[PDB]
Amino acid sequence: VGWELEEVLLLDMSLDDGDSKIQNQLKKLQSPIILLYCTKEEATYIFEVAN
Amino acid sequence: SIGIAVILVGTSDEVAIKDAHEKDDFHHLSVVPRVELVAMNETDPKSIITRICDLMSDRKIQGVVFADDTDQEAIAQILDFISAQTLTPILGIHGGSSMIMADKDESSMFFQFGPSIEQQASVMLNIMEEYDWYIFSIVTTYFPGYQDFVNKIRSTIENSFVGWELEEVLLLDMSLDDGDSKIQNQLKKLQSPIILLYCTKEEATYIFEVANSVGLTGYGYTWIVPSLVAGDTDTVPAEFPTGLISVSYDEWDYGLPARVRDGIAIITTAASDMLSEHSFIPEPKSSCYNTHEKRIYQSNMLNRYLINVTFEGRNLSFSEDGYQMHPKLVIILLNKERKWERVGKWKDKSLQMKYYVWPDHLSIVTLEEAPFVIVESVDPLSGTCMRNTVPCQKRIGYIKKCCKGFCIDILKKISKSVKFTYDLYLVTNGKHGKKINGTWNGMI
Amino acid sequence: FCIDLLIKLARTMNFTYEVHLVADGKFGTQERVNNSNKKEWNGMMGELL
Amino acid sequence: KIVNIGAVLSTRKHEQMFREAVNQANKRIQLNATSVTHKPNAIQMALSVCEDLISSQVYAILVSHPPTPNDHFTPTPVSYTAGFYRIPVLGLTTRMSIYSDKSIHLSFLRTVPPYSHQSSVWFEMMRVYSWNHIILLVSDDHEGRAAQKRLETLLEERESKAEKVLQFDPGTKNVTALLMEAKELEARVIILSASEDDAATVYRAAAMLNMTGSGYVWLVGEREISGNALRYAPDGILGLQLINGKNESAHISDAVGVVAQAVHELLEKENITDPPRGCVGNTNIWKTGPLFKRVLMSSKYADGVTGRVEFNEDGDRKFANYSIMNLQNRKLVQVGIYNGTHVIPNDRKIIWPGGETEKPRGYQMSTRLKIVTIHQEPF
């Protein structure tokens, strides 16, 4: 079945003042469907960064 | 004689300007220009007002040329009264007096050395034509020129056969309180490589900051922006993305001594034609007291001749609204450091840009073969390159042509499959390839 | 054929008409015309608008 | 401190109320009044704005209707001269739409709506009377273009357009050429946005083209139902009027109150800079001025003499109220009202142009058609 994958992009928590680069990293995400995998705390941080 | 009172504000080269008065040659027109130079600091508008009328009653000057260094827009508005109440021509050659105001008085004699927002929009489309950029997007605030800016762009799109695709005309209102979420909601519809922004200089930093929150400010984008946002090119707020394109006036080349010379010429030759055709010397009441009784004498005729002026083969023609029909504009681009560098030059609807190629992306060589790579001249039906063609260059004589063939159609299908950009160019050193003295020439 | 169809249209829609041929003699296309620098239709298409 | 709020108003008698108006606000940290009459000469008017500022250091300026019948150009000397320092100026009795642009009039707020805001009345009146095909008779001036520009925007909101937007040069004596084109148009609803002088020419021609008969509707603003235009307007002119536009004292009291609330807002802030002492060398732009102007729009009055006083984003009035006259028996009798959100017609009926009691449809069908054919062999 036709499957196409856009990005497997990884992003970091432990980096201090990493908000600017984590936003810069998330720029490459253009696909309409996201398969997220992180902690519940990290999910809000990702969602607020995507916010 | 003609009374002209060139006024300089702030720091300027008065001696250099005074020399241009001697170099001003209008013997053929026989204008007798009585040019007077007065220099005085900006101070207050009452001083600005009282400098003219008091000096008007002293020499009965016919015209005024006003120069400035400050970027206060209020100077242009104040200069309209003396152009309207006193019916005396006023030239906004430099500074704040050259800040083009869209709407003037219906009887004002004011004229300015600047481009209109429709003229800046037209050249912003010539930049995209030169490099074959056809994807569009427009983002405007509630600034008063937003209606004219968008209308000129939309009209120019449909009046030409060149393929123009306008995605959205996104409009953002800054009056909202805590409307960053709302301003982001509208701004999120932006999905075009090229964005034509029109707002105040302050708003652009706010816009770019919100776009910074999105983060898609500049990576392959090329924001094109009028000179309103650029403002003082010395001060870059560092929130402007690198690669910004703006259309500024020729401040680098046309210095104050150059502009003052044109100011004297424009007033003089306008009166000479009236002094010859109409043969009536304009001598209005120089006093500013009880101007209601002074409206019997009207010099609306001089407005006609001031519009159409020829000087040294340059069509120094204004508008009924006070712009310049044929201004000289330069396209300024942000460099890697926060510096505006001139890249282009627009004059008489011609774009003499110095960048032949706009700076993955890779370069590709090509030859001329019968069914594989056929090079043709630029398309005359609509301009540039038509369908099924790509733009290719050749050097002898750097000329942009259109390339098409079996090999190119392969390149087009490969390019959007491998997801890369390219710029073809034909061979000058030879053909396919030959090893001469251990050296390779041509495509290989 | 067109005029016979036109007469039927008038009877069934209760209107009168004034048939006049095309000044240009052409059906209609979008043209550049650099003299005026404007896109306009020519002839039959240009008489409707 | 001694916050100065002095105005520049004509009608010496009205200025007496301004002193009482300031004193009333004080009873409600200090406001001082330095009202000065209007200089008849425009050039002398501009200097007196800052010359009176020398001894006052005023925070805002109020301008009103002068004794002269110009009714425009009066705020220009007081707006640009004060606009150099970003001093907010209040448009007590000015209705021209030129003062609605921030680029040219940088610091100006209007306590009355401009003439170009009548088209908000008209567009909502359409759905009340079920009208969709209209004819616009705007003029070539900026005032005529502003009315056309705003009316068109509302029309596009409903996915509808005006049938024709005929524009005529102001001061034109022979307007029959313009109205000649408007006769063949199917729309019988005519909207005129001209001045009082230009309206007379339109009315004279429309009378002799038989356009004032039955089945015709004339929607008209305040300028063309008064003065010279009223003396030639036909019957059934569905005019418009402002409740208290000509009353200065109604607006001064509300205007003074609005600035007083912003004065309280100005009490607490960061880096408050007092306005320039005079016009000598104060080239500063009064950085606090934009802050004063920005908070002056957001300052909404809970009550007032003329109801709630709200300022638009462009400084115009918000949620105003308009009165719908009607030239019944040569007498303008109100047959409706505007509550700011929708038209509330009066109990009495409307006598339409031509004396028609029933509401005209305002539309027609040509029936006679022009048909263009080409020469084709079988067709």
UniProtKB/Swiss-Prot annotation, chain A:
Distribution of this protein across tissues and organs: Primarily found in the fronto-parieto-temporal cortex and hippocampus pyramidal cells, lower expression in the basal ganglia.
Localisation: Cell membrane; Postsynaptic cell membrane; Cell projection, Dendrite; Late endosome
PTM notes: Phosphorylated on tyrosine residues.
Family per similarity comment: Belongs to the glutamate-gated ion channel (TC 1.A.10.1) family. NR2B/GRIN2B subfamily.
The record's note on its domains: The extracellular N-terminal domain (NTD) endows NMDARs with a unique capacity for allosteric modulation, harboring several binding sites for small molecule ligands that act as subunit-specific allosteric modulators of ion channel activity.
Record: disease: Intellectual developmental disorder, autosomal dominant 6, with or without seizures: A disorder characterized by significantly below average general intellectual functioning associated with impairments in adaptive behavior and manifested during the developmental period. MRD6 additional features may include seizures, hypotonia, abnormal movements, such as dystonia, and autistic features. Developmental and epileptic encephalopathy 27: A form of epileptic encephalopathy, a heterogeneous group of severe early-onset epilepsies characterized by refractory seizures, neurodevelopmental impairment, and poor prognosis. Development is normal prior to seizure onset, after which cognitive and motor delays become apparent.
Stated role: Component of N-methyl-D-aspartate (NMDA) receptors (NMDARs) that function as heterotetrameric, ligand-gated cation channels with high calcium permeability and voltage-dependent block by Mg(2+). Participates in synaptic plasticity for learning and memory formation by contributing to the long-term depression (LTD) of hippocampus membrane currents. Channel activation requires binding of the neurotransmitter L-glutamate to the GluN2 subunit, glycine or D-serine binding to the GluN1 subunit, plus membrane depolarization to eliminate channel inhibition by Mg(2+).
Subunit structure: Heterotetramer. Forms heterotetrameric channels composed of two GluN1/zeta subunits (GRIN1), and two identical GluN2/epsilon subunits (GRIN2A, GRIN2B, GRIN2C or GRIN2D) or GluN3 subunits (GRIN3A or GRIN3B) (in vitro). Can also form heterotetrameric channels that contain at least two GluN1 subunits and at least two different GluN2 subunits (or a combination of one GluN2 and one GluN3 subunits) (in vitro). In vivo, the subunit composition may depend on the expression levels of the different subunits. Found in a complex with GRIN1 and GRIN3B. Found in a complex with GRIN1, GRIN3A and PPP2CB.
Designated name of the protein: Glutamate receptor ionotropic, NMDA 2B
Gene that this polypeptide is encoded by: GRIN2B
From Swiss-Prot, chain C:
Annotated localization: Cell membrane; Postsynaptic cell membrane; Postsynaptic density membrane; Synaptic cell membrane
Glycosylated position list: 14, 34
Coiled coil: none
Record note on modification: NMDA is probably regulated by C-terminal phosphorylation of an isoform of GRIN1 by PKC. Its phosphorylated state is influenced by the formation of the NMDAR-PPP2CB complex and the NMDAR channel activity.
Domain notes: A hydrophobic region that gives rise to the prediction of a transmembrane span does not cross the membrane, but is part of a discontinuously helical region that dips into the membrane and is probably part of the pore and of the selectivity filter. The extracellular N-terminal domain (NTD) is a site of allosteric regulation to modulate overall receptor function.
Disease: Neurodevelopmental disorder with or without hyperkinetic movements and seizures, autosomal dominant: An autosomal dominant neurodevelopmental disorder characterized by severe intellectual disability and developmental delay, absent speech, muscular hypotonia, dyskinesia, and hyperkinetic movements. Cortical blindness, cerebral atrophy, and seizures are present in some patients. Neurodevelopmental disorder with or without hyperkinetic movements and seizures, autosomal recessive: An autosomal recessive neurodevelopmental disorder characterized by severe intellectual disability and psychomotor developmental delay, involuntary and stereotypic movements, spasticity, and inability to walk without support. Intractable seizures manifest in some patients.
Subunit-level organization: Heterotetramer; the NMDAR subunits are modular and harbor tiered domains that function in concert to regulate opening and closing of the cation-selective ion channel pore. Forms heterotetrameric channels composed of two GluN1/zeta subunits (GRIN1), and two identical GluN2/epsilon subunits (GRIN2A, GRIN2B, GRIN2C or GRIN2D) or GluN3 subunits (GRIN3A or GRIN3B) (in vitro). Can also form heterotetrameric channels that contain at least two GluN1 subunits and at least two different GluN2 subunits (or a combination of one GluN2 and one GluN3 subunits) (in vitro).
Family label: Belongs to the glutamate-gated ion channel (TC 1.A.10.1) family. NR1/GRIN1 subfamily.
Protein's name in the database: Glutamate receptor ionotropic, NMDA 1
Residues of the full protein shown: 458 to 506 of 938
